[PDB]
Amino acid sequence: NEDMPVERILEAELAVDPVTNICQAADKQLFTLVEWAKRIPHFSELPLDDQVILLRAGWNELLIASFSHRSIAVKDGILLATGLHVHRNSAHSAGVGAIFDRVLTELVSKMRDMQMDKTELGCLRAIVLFNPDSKGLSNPAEVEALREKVYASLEAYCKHKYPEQPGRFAKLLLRLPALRSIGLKCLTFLMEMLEA
Amino acid sequence: SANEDMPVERILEAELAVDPVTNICQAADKQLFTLVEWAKRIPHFSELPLDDQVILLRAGWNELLIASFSHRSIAVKDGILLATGLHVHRNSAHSAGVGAIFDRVLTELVSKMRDMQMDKTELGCLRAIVLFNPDSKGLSNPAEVEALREKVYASLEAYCKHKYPEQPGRFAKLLLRLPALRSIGLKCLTFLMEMLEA
Amino acid sequence: PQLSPEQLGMIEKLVAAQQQCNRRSFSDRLRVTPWPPQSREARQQRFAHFTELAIVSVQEIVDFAKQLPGFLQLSREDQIALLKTSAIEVMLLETSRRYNPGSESITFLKDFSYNREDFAKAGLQVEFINPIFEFSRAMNELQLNDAEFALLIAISIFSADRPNVQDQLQVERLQHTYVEALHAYVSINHPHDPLMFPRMLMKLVSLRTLSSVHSEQVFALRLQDKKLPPLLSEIWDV
């Protein structure tokens, strides 16, 4: 059956200049990615080396999805993990407006219009995480297998939970190409010691 | 025979034969084609396997271009002269928010070149040393490239001793610009419509 | 839920349009500069050859896109934008469809077969060649047929998040048609293998990366003073 409990996945999600405000937000969250992925089924049974590889490869898309979902509320910007906000207008004034709009239109906006839920966002983040194509993977097929388990589980969840919307599963996945493209464009003591 | 193994004359010929940021990138793009044209004139480089030539240029290209416009910028005051002929001043660089790395270019490269009056042959040799970098990945024979770079060491030193016998420390002063160059380099990193309607 | 006569008809139209593009390309194959070890000339001729091929493929994609329901009913502005970014993706899907797992080669226009070396001897770099060959091998494992490729291509073309798309709303509506059809089609023809559909859609994600790796290949060829011809440049440089 579903060997990728959406319960656990949702749990993990629960467990956790304008540019400088975002960069500071990222640092605060960088230190949750191991605790988040910790709580994802079967991740901790992967070789330590591989786990590092999957977070190294996934981290930025992992972070982007999350703050995106969170900003479903805000009207024209994002709620950072710092508690602050960033409005379109200061994003454009800074110089990262084009990439900002992409996130608003292709992510934020879309997640709101379809009201994707925390369980869904989490399964998507689990798919991003279980990426078998990352270089240096010890057993790619293993990660491949775990990514498909999320396929199955996410679908079953959608079918049962939203049986009126037969295209919902497919609609979630189709957020991932946009995430990928967005992700790619988004890339004292000494004094004392001296004196003493 | 140091110069014979890596003729300083050929290197000079190689050099002779060839918003602000947007304008700088454009100038860079314009200067791309000169990389192969410059390199083939540097002795022994064309004897390298085609695959290694490509790797050497892929690895060195930004350092090669930075060295060149810096030397060209000797005459300009607190700025650089692009291959397109535009000047870019300090003041315009800060306003565009690249003033940090721009100031480093001016003081570590342009000013140094000015004050020592580094000549075209020296510049060419420094660029040859950047080119012949044996530490780039995927080289079919790094030891070969390394032998070539050591031939520039010896040839450059002989030239410095000959042309500037009063400056015993000159050679070392030329080399002492490569670390600063390297760090600057690291930091710096109709038709379709026809088909449609037809 | 099944496929209606209309959907079966639309699918057939797609497969037919692609076959039709194949024949005209094949018929126009003689137009391309002929395939010629430390020789620069030979290397430049192999690159000339590939760019000529690619131009032929661009014409195939445009002809095929002009035949998609609703495509012409968009602003020319949006048509261009959709073609400009989807081009390299469609070409990579076509590459996977033509991958020969035995000789690890790709065969274009019926009798033009190329392996890794052939691309390297043209001057292409390994960080470009390898992931594409890796992508093709993985796609080939899926054993997609004509219908499945035709739909995956149409889904790729109707991608609303391409830069400079005006009516993103309409593009998504158009895309939805083909996604709906592909889902129904897999569930009817691969009833026991429902992971097929998720897997196919996930290829669309890889193409994003592969598109980026192709951009890097382009600026790299430029380091070798190998510029794209006008049409390609317009699509892939600018």
Add this chain to the structure above:
Amino acid sequence: PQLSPEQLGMIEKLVAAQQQCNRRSFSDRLRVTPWPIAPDPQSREARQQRFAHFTELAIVSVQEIVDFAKQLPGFLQLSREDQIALLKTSAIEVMLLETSRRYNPGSESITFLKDFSYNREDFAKAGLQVEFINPIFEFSRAMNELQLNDAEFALLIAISIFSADRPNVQDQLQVERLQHTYVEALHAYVSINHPHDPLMFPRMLMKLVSLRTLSSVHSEQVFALRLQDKKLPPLLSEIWDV
């Protein structure tokens, strides 16, 4: 044409300052968290304890480099902000020079303190990525092949500390003047002590170029550690984090 008394004196001081800093720091070798003996490759905790071990020794190395810098004629006469500016950016390069000095070509390891050898595997086991480990090992190998002596590493270390292009240097001219003195000494030394190996000098200076790359690779390694648990202890943090 030979080394002046001044240069001879200056080199004796450098060599002595290094050996003495080496012992001033020896007094707390085992005071460092020990190397695990856990036989579980998959243990996140044996792994965190290896990383802790290294960050501890790294802090001992930083202290030693600061102790050595103070012994450099001219360093203490620089503004306090300049001294810091030079130290924060020179630190990793000196540690890598120090690393290359202690590379054992036979076992392919680096010995930090008698019976403290470490190979590539040992560093991977602390969670350090291969794009950091391999270049450093390649660098230490090539450095070892030059067979520099104590005086040469010491001069090289001083040239590296006295780099005028480090971010936030105010008195660039004084720093250059200071560095020129060591470069000039190294040249005379190489020429007197390697009379039939002239390329030794340019090869040594080119190593200063490689250091800049390795420093960049090191800073990528610091970011990568954040993607795990591994935060840097407070001293290493202000030097390297941001």
